[PDB]
Structure formats: C-alpha cells, structure tokens
C-alpha cells in the first residue's frame, strides 16, 4: 500500500451479449464480485438502458465498483476501485471475467490518493 | 472515437469542510452533471463513520462519482460520460471550483474505442 486505494479501469471485449443485456444477472454477478474482493457493500443500483445495455454501481466502504455494458458491441466498461489492505480488486476482476465470458481484456491499475501526494 | 470519455481525477488541498458536507457534495455533484449536459438516472450520497462522503450520480449509460477524505483534503473524482454532447470537462470545472482544489491530476481515458471494439 502506497495509496488510499487501488483502481482497476477495465475494458472487456467479446463478452456474452445475452449476459451483458441481463440486468438481474449483471447485478447478481457484481455483488458476488464485491464479495470475492472482501469488500462491504453499502448500496447498489442497476438500470436497463434502452434498447439494450445495463449500467450499475456498487458503493463500497469508501469507493465503488461499476459496470456499463454495450450488448450490441460485446463490450463492457468496468471499474473496480477498492480501499484497504483487506480488499483485492483483482478478485472482482476475475469473477467478472468469468461471469461475462470476455475473450479479450485490457486493465490498467491506478493508485488513488498516493501517500506521497496527500 | 470511443463510446465514452472518462476523467480519473485526483483533487488535492480542497476545502475540508466542503469535503465533509454530504448535502453540499450532493448539490455540487448534481450541478456538475447539469453543467456537463448529462441526464441523471439516479443519485446516492453517503456520509459514514467519523467523516468522509461517497457519492454517485448515475447518468444515462455511465457515472459521475466522488469519494472524499476530509482529513487529507483529498477527493477521488471520476467523470465518465458518453456521447458527443456531454462534456465531462464542464463537470470537472464545476467541481474544481466548488471544492476549492489547489492542485489536480487528471487522466482521460477513452472507454470503448471504436478501433478496439471494431466499429467504423
């Protein structure tokens, strides 16, 4: 730990498009992702974009997990921002990779609140 | 050339009383969404311990978020917008002003690049 939090900005490509358009399943998988990471969920809110697409946010202790899907393109924008030694955003990543069946992913890990800056 | 634009922002040396004011953070975040041109879907703001605010404004197909650390004068801000007439930099400007940040660091990501997804 050299920062308040760790933030994964993930591009998920060639996903299962049925899953990407399933608002209930996406919400379920996001909550399980949060459980896998060690995080505690404060609130969650998921919405059906029309005609296709799911958007959701899981608020955790001091930060968030988010997903925005484009079923028509097989694409999801995922963000996994966790704080604390106890919580591992890569565990959420792995769950979602498997839940969405992405064939290609790109992930960047940012530090949020570096100790040497704050 | 992408489905969305996403600003990952570090705000430093902010007004610490603002950072711990959940009502004001909600107002300013909603104002920031308005400035950007985004449509609000839902908004949820939390203040929980002994300080610190978390807020999310869910917009059409993406989000604006803030998580504050009053004890450090720091806020973690994310401004993810989609579509050509929504401008996340207008949200940035509003929040920079509202929070009285003296120093900022911002990464702008292209989320869903057309060349990566395979869109002409």
UniProtKB/Swiss-Prot annotation, chain B:
Gene that produces this protein: speH
Protein's pathway: Amine and polyamine biosynthesis; S-adenosylmethioninamine biosynthesis; S-adenosylmethioninamine from S-adenosyl-L-methionine: step 1/1
Cofactor(s) this protein requires: pyruvate
Cofactor note text: Binds 1 pyruvoyl group covalently per subunit.
Broad enzyme group: lyase
Catalytic residues of the enzyme: 62 (schiff-base intermediate with substrate), 67 (proton acceptor), 82 (proton donor)
NCBIfam families: SAM_DCase_Bsu
UniProt-listed InterPro entries: AdoMetDC_C, AdoMetDC_fam_prok, AdoMetDC_N, S-AdoMet_deCO2ase_core, S-AdoMet_deCOase_pro-enz
Protein family according to the UniProt entry: Belongs to the prokaryotic AdoMetDC family. Type 1 subfamily.
GO BP terms: spermidine biosynthetic process
Protein name from the UniProt record: S-adenosylmethionine decarboxylase proenzyme
Classification lineage: Bacteria, Thermotogati, Thermotogota, Thermotogae, Thermotogales
EC numbers, comma separated: 4.1.1.50
Consequence recorded when altering residue 54 to A: Cleaves more rapidly than the wild-type
UniProt cross-references to SUPFAM superfamilies, sorted A to Z: S-adenosylmethionine decarboxylase
Record's catalysed reaction(s): S-adenosyl-L-methionine + H(+) = S-adenosyl 3-(methylsulfanyl)propylamine + CO2
GO molecular function, one term: adenosylmethionine decarboxylase activity
């Amino acid at each position: 730990m050299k920062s308040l939090g760790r933030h994964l900005v993930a591009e998920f490509y060639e996903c299962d498009r049925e899953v990407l358009d399933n608002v209930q399943l996406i919400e379920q998988e996001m909550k399980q992702a949060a459980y896998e990471s060690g995080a505690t969920i404060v609130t969650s809110t998921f919405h059906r974009f029309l005609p296709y697409g799911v958007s959701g946010v899981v608020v955790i202790s001091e930060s968030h997990l988010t997903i925005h899907t484009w079923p028509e393109y097989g694409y999801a924008a995922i963000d996994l921002f966790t704080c604390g030694e106890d919580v591992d955003p890569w565990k959420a990543f792995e769950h979602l990779k498997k839940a969405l069946k992405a064939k290609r992913v790109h992930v960047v890990e940012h530090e949020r609140g570096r100790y040497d800056e704050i």
